[PDB]
Structure formats: structure tokens, C-alpha cells
């Protein structure tokens, strides 16, 4: 402490943090950079931003911060404020709504050889193109491009500490699993600086979403309502409640469209899987409503005003039922005429009832075929939209 006080006084007597810390200006400052991911705070899909808690370990040698421990009581390593010394100016290129550079200036560990290890913390808010093509079963390849802003590769060289980010202290996420993580070094020529390539290290993270929450809270209700859609065709017309069921299902699916459209970004690069399913099921419900209205209109066909066409009697009464229950004194004379009139009226009523029953039978055969077709279409559409991705995810091991 007395020894270290004397050492610290000596080291910064004539020190400069402006110049690069090399004996000769023609040399390159060799910086080792290693990213440690502590926590994946958030993946905002709507705003396409990833929030992470990181430690940006930076190692380099300062030529002018060496000493002999024998002259200072054997002190071999010290901790000093980072603001006093030259540091590399690492910037996150793809910063979205956070800070470009480190702002938390923690201490550096300085060895007697001049080696410096500075491990600042950071909250990175980085851009990420969110591909929603398979949401909620989607995989996101995000990145963190880090580089010295003002120093080109000929004066400061950054090298990755490791091929991969350090996940040894990573906190497990309840929403995402990091499948793969890599760190690649790149040299890039920018139009601003034609002849001086600048270096960067890009850390890539491939992450798979855990889909349980969205399955339970979104998909299952939609499946329930879309299954209820097909049941209008088994519900009798005389119930007077076909429209109630179908229209209430439609309104519920609209209210769920609200949630689903707030859950995704408004980009046009691709239509999401959940969006495709919602549009398909809305069109499914609307077709069911239209066909149900047609069926109801067929069921209530007045035999007096409407006459059964021959093609209807051939298609729905003769052919389809085979494919798929049963087919198809003045006073005394005036009183006698009255009894005869009553009998004739009963005859006319019976014939009218039979014609109405024929119309109702046609409507019901339509209902049976439609129940079968709509249950098959619902099941097969759901599978055609989901199984393609689910099989792939099950295959991915």
C-alpha cells in the first residue's frame, strides 16, 4: 500500500493516455478480446432488438506501465482506474437503442510485466433481423459486431480470445436455448477509409425459442375455436342457433387476431406461420358461415314459392345418399261439402309438407357432406401448417 502508493505515483508521473502504448509507433497494439454472455435479457421481436448482459474482456500490454517488483516490496499486480490509461475503443456496430461503447469504467488489473486485463460490464441492445417464418417454432441467428472505431488494423489489431463466447457464467433463459455460438474475425474496407481495412470480431448466437408459453396461451384456444367451427354442420337448422355458434367463433378468432398481430413485427420479408394459420382459419370460418347460410336457405325453401330442380333431385336425393337416413236441404249438402273440403285441405297440407321435407332432406344431406369435408379440411390444414416445422424440429435432435 505504501509500496503500491509509491508505485502508482511513479507510473502516472509522466504518463499519456492519448498515444498508443507501444515503444515504437510502427508497432501494432495486440489486443485480445473475449465476450462473456451472462444473460440474454430480452428478444424484442416487434422492435427487432436483443438485450444482453455481457462482460467484454480486453487484454493488452502497455509498454510504459511496467515495473520491477523488487523495487516496490514485491508488489506484482495492482488494480487501477481504467479512465487514467489508454484503452482500445471497442464499439458495437449494430447497436440499436443502447450505447455504442463501454460506459461502465471498472478497474483494470495491471501486472508488473505491463499486461492489462480490463473486464467491463455492458448491457448491449443490438439489432437483429427477426425471421418469423416459423414463429412460435422459430430459430434466430443474432450477432454482435465489435470493433475499434478510430484505429485501423495497421495500428491496433484485435484477436479473439477463444473461438466461442464464454458461456460458463451464462444464466439459463426461460424462453431461449443457445444452440450454437461462434466468434469470427473479419477485415473490412469501408468507403470512408479507402486504403485502411478496419477489423472486427462478430459474435454469432443461434437461439431456438421454447414454444410452450405460446402453445398454451395462443395456439390451444385457436385450435379449440377452429374445431368448434365444423360443428355448425352437425347442428340442426331447426335449432335456430347455427349463426350463433359460427358468428361467435368468428368474433373470438378476430379477438385472437388482435393478440397475434401485436406479438410479431410488421415487416414484409415473410408472412409468419401463425399469421398464415390465422388467415387460413379465418377464411375457413367465413366459408363455413357462407355455406351455412346457403344450407339454412335451402332448409327453409317454401314448396309453394320454390320448386325442386331435377338436378337437385338427381344429385342430393339419388346419387349422394347412396355414397354416404331414408331417401326422399241446403244445409246437409253444405255440411257434406264442408267435410270434403276438410279432406282436400288435409291432402294439400300433406303434399306441401312432403315437398318441404324433400327440401329439408336435401339441406341435411348437404350438412352431412359438409361436416365430413370440414372436419377433414380442418385436420389436414392444421397438419399442413404445423407438421412441416414440427417434424424438422423433432429431427434436429
Amino acid at each position: 500500500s505504501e509500496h503500491e502508493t509509491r508505485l502508482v505515483a511513479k507510473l502516472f508521473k509522466d504518463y499519456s493516455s492519448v498515444v498508443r502504448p507501444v515503444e515504437d509507433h510502427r508497432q501494432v497494439v495486440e489486443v485480445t478480446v473475449g465476450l462473456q454472455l451472462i444473460q440474454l435479457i430480452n428478444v424484442d421481436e416487434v422492435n427487432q432488438i436483443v438485450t444482453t448482459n455481457v462482460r467484454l474482456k480486453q487484454q493488452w500490454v502497455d509498454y510504459n506501465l511496467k515495473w520491477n517488483p523488487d523495487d516496490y516490496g514485491g508488489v506484482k499486480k495492482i488494480h487501477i482506474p481504467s479512465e487514467k490509461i489508454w484503452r482500445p475503443d471497442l464499439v458495437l456496430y449494430n447497436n440499436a437503442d443502447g450505447d455504442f461503447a463501454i460506459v461502465k469504467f471498472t478497474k483494470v488489473l495491471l501486472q508488473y510485466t505491463g499486461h492489462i486485463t480490463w473486464t467491463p460490464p455492458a448491457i448491449f441492445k443490438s439489432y437483429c433481423e427477426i425471421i418469423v417464418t416459423h414463429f412460435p417454432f422459430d430459430e434466430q441467428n443474432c450477432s454482435m459486431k465489435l470493433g475499434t472505431w478510430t484505429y485501423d488494423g495497421s495500428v491496433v489489431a484485435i484477436n479473439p480470445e477463444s473461438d466461442q463466447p464464454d458461456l460458463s457464467n451464462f444464466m439459463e433463459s426461460g424462453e431461449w436455448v443457445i444452440k450454437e455460438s461462434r466468434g469470427w474475425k473479419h477485415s473490412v474496407t469501408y468507403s470512408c477509409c479507402p486504403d485502411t481495412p478496419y477489423l472486427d470480431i462478430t459474435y454469432h448466437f443461434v437461439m431456438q425459442r421454447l414454444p410452450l408459453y405460446f402453445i398454451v396461451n395462443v395456439i390451444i384456444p385457436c385450435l379449440l375455436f377452429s374445431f368448434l367451427t365444423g360443428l355448425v354442420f352437425y347442428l340442426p337448422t331447426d335449432s335456430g342457433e347455427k349463426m350463433t355458434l359460427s358468428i361467435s367463433v368468428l368474433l373470438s378468432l378476430t379477438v385472437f387476431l388482435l393478440v397475434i398481430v401485436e406479438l410479431i413485427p410488421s415487416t414484409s420479408s415473410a408472412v409468419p406461420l401463425i399469421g398464415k394459420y390465422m388467415l387460413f382459419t379465418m377464411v375457413f370460418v367465413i366459408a363455413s358461415i357462407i355455406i351455412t347460410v346457403i344450407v339454412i336457405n335451402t332448409h327453409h325453401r317454401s314448396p309453394s314459392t320454390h320448386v325442386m330442380p331435377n338436378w337437385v333431385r338427381k344429385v342430393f336425393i339419388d346419387t349422394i345418399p347412396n355414397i354416404m337416413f331414408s331417401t326422399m236441404h241446403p244445409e246437409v249438402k253444405s255440411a257434406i261439402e264442408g267435410i270434403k273440403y276438410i279432406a282436400e285441405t288435409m291432402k294439400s297440407d300433406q303434399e306441401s309438407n312432403n315437398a318441404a321435407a324433400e327440401w329439408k332432406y336435401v339441406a341435411m344431406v348437404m350438412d352431412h357432406i359438409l361436416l365430413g369435408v370440414f372436419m377433414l379440411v380442418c385436420i389436414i390444414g392444421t397438419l399442413a401448417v404445423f407438421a412441416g416445422r414440427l417434424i424438422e424440429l423433432n429431427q434436429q435432435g
Binding site: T5, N53, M171, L210, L235, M346, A357
Partner: protein, 405 residues
Amino acid sequence: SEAEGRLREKLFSGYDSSVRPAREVGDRVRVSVGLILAQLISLNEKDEEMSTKVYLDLEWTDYRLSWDPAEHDGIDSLRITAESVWLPDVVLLNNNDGNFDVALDISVVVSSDGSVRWQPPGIYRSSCSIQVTYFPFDWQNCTMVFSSYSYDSSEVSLQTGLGGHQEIHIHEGTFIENGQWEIIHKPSRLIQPPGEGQRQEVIFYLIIRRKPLFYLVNVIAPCILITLLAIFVFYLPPDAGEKMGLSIFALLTLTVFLLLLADKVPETSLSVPIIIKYLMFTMVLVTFSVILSVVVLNLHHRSPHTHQMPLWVRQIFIHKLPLYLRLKRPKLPELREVVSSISYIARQLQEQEDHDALKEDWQFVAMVVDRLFLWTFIIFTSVGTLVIFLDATYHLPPPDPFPSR
């Protein structure tokens, strides 16, 4: 005081607050770490973060800040701005918002023997992994990990604050008690480094049990009521023409209450909350009520001439099942032209009687099936609700902060 000024001038001549106090190389500064909880501000499930207001209690020794009181007019202690002295770089490692430091640096109290006591206030947002399985009847285990950010265990040693109480200190009179969380256990532990750059930690644990009254009032009871109405759908006669409306509006109201829950539940995917499981169970029950009401309406409205009742349906749903369900079914041109008309009318009415008998038989089958479904729904609802409620109620907080597993 002029004497205090002279003592302060003496103490800080040649003093470097950036240099750790160590009379010899290899000496370690022993730092006692305690925590006083002034308020548990919140536990945000969505962000998975515990917000607390606390006072740290940091104690160490700085040999450079010692003096003889007799030589300085009997002054035995000093209050000095914390920026003027070396501080241990103690930070909340597991903070969730990027803030590592204390809210206000205030002053240290230095005794004449070099003992430094520092009690800074701190408003902290710490990461807490929310166990969602039994929410809102859940208990949480929210740690606050304190450690030196820079110095290793060979330079600065840590110990739990105790003089021995290994617990977060809560003052009974002045503690702002949360209206949603009860504190069950509040221990503190020193964690040795894993096994040089190695470091110790001091972790303060808060075991907290939620008070679930709100969720019992705003979610559970309405769900029970809607479930009870979904049951009573099966007692509604088919001829009323209201089964579909009742069941469907029950499902829609359940959707409204799911929208209510959507603002409160956690968003993780490691498990499903028990209240969400109960909501999904209820939604499936009402959906099946809709399905079975459609089936009953189909049976009731079955046209008698277009359908012939299968003999097996007759035996099952008219002879055997009603006994089990306690359903008892109750029970001369003029003259010739007149005779023919009268006989035709009688024949038509006999045909109507036969048609009505078949209609009533189909409707009785519908009634029997409705009663069967009513009893089945009562049994299934009661059993599932009882199972879920007993699972929720028997979930209790730990009796020991560190169970043996």
C-alpha cells in the same frame, strides 16, 4: 472544529484512496458484509426481477486511517465523505438492469483504530428466476449476490455481517411490508470460490410467499361460477333454443378472464402455471359442453320419418340407461264421398300419431343423453377442480432455507 480539521489534514497527507490498504504484500482486507431491507418494492414476473430498497453494512479496517485520540483533543471517530477513502469494490453481481453500485455514496464512519463502517443506501433490481409452476399460490427464492468486482479472494476477503446473525436485518417498526409478499426466510451465506483471480461471494436469500387473495377474487371465483353454468347447460331443455348461446358465451367469458390473466402471469416456457392449467381445463370443459350440446340438439330434432332409430339405440337409451339415471318415462254418391273423407281424415291422424310417437322417442333419447352428460360433467368437473385445488393448496413454502436434496 479546528482540531478535527488538523486531524483530517494529518490523516490524508500522502493517502491514496485508489490503493487497497495492505501493510504487507499478501495481507488481505477482511470485509464484513451485512444487509438491511428497508422495503421489498416489487417482484416483476414479466421481467423476472426483484426490486428492493436496502442499506448495505460494510465494515473493514484501513490501517492508514488510525490515530491516537489523546493527541487530537480526544476525537475518537470521524465522518468522512466516502469518496475520500479507499472503498471495497462491492457490487451486486446479479443485477438485472446494469446498475452495479449504491444509490448514494454518503459518508463513512472511521474510528481511531482504523475501523471503517459504511452504510450506503441502495435501490437494486436483481435477477430472479421465477418458478411459475404454482403461481399465484407460489413461493419464490430471490438471491442478491454481493462481491468485489475487481479484487480477488487473495486481496479482499469477505465475511457475512454478524456480531452471530447470518440473516438480512429487518427492523420491525420501520419496515415497509409488501402487500403481495410475506417474507418466510432471510438467510445470508458466504460462498467460497469454486473449488488466482478467484473470488468469494456473500449471498442474501429472500424466500417470499405470495398472498393470493386478489387472484382468488378476480380469477378463481369467476371461473368457478362460469364452470357451474357450463354444467347447467345440460339441464336446459332443447326446445328453449338457448344451449348454444349459454355454452358459447361461457367460453367467451372464460376468454375474457384469460385476457385478464395475460397481463399478470410470467412469460417463461419451462412450465405452465397451475392457474393457467385450471383455465385451460375449464376452457376444454366448456368446449366439450358445446360439442355435447350440439350432439343432444341433433338427437332431439331428429326427424322421425327421415331417420329410423337403431334397435341398439332403443335398448341402450330407452330401457337400460333410464333405470340407472332414475329417469322414469311416463306411461248414394254423397254418403260414399262422406265415408271416404272421414276415413281419410282418420287415417291421416293415425299416421300423425305414429309420427309423433317416433318423434317423442327420439326426444326421450335426447333427454336421457342430456342427463347422462349432466352427471358426467358434474363428476369430471368436481374431480378435476378438486385435484387442481388440492395441488395448489398443499404447495407450502420450505421449512428450512437450504433443504437437503
